[PDB]
Design a protein around this nucleic acid. Structure first.
Ligand SMILES: [Ca+2]
Length: 78
DNA sequence: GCTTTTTTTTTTCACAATCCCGGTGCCGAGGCCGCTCAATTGGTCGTAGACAGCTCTAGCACCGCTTAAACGCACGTACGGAATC
């Protein structure tokens, strides 16, 4: 009955947190802190989270509404 | 071995759709009536085909050559289908 709680951590989650936010939103900075809130402070995972972007359009998971140079305002169904 | 972490999975909860009930009423299944016309009865008359008795067609069995076709193997090319995009 204590503090730590958070995510399931991959493309099951990049699709779940982007959908677990009630509405649309920007960048690596929104998605990672929702994914690292439990206590696992970000170390080497920084390249691993970063990679997910081409992996999502190539495998067809999130369309990006906004964003250019490692920024991406990712969408699901409206 | 042991973390660091995919995927896989399971769990959970919310939503939508379909499933099952009783209530209601409307109408066509069902059955009855009376009359009709088509099935039955009891009659005759002729021929369709059953049957015996015959013929002799063609279906079956057999036999021995001469191939042409079938069989098996060696080899490798291009096709099927699996994986990714
Ligand atoms: Ca008769």
């Amino acid at each position: 009955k204590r503090k730590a709680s958070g995510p399931p951590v991959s493309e099951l989650i990049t699709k779940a947190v982007a959908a677990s936010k009630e509405r649309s939103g920007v960048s690596l900075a929104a998605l990672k802190k929702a994914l690292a809130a439990a206590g696992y402070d970000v170390e080497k995972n920084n390249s691993r989270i970063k990679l997910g972007l081409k992996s999502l359009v190539s495998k067809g998971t999130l369309v990006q509404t906004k964003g250019t140079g490692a920024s991406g305002s990712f969408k699901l169904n409206k």
